[PDB]
Design a binder for this molecule. Sequence first.
Ligand SMILES: CSc1nc(N2CCOC[C@H]2C)cc(C2(S(=N)(N)=O)CC2)n1
Length: 135
Amino acid sequence: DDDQVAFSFILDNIVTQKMMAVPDSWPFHHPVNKKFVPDYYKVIVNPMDLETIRKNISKHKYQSRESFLDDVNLILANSVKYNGPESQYTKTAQEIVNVCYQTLTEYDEHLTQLEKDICTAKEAALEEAELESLD
Ligand SMILES: CSc1nc(N2CCOC[C@H]2C)cc(C2(S(=N)(N)=O)CC2)n1
């Protein structure tokens, strides 16, 4: 609830202040424009980028670090597929993933608290929704 908002703020500041600050991270800031890279979506079936993650964050898509890190890792996997494992683009995506990991670790204790309280809050909301519906 209130905890979901704090969690999303932390994630968004990790994205804007750490991941987007990686040198030359511009290729991963926004979705690829088909008019500029015409092959991209023929190759990349589950696209992902830092802007889309911010929008998912603002929609409170992420209740835990795990689903957040699923999407962050999709950025890296897509660079590996389209650009190659040894490419400079993939080197940059890997740095983006590492700074994300590093920053989450700094805030592990606080983020673990939030995830716990977010989950117990969502269970309280779901359990009462079902009790209200049958009663
Ligand atoms: C070479 S131009 C270009 N490349 C990009 N990447 C994506 C990562 O892999 C390599 C290459 C395909 C991404 C972009 C933009 S853009 N929206 N112009 O379309 C900002 C998103 N531009």
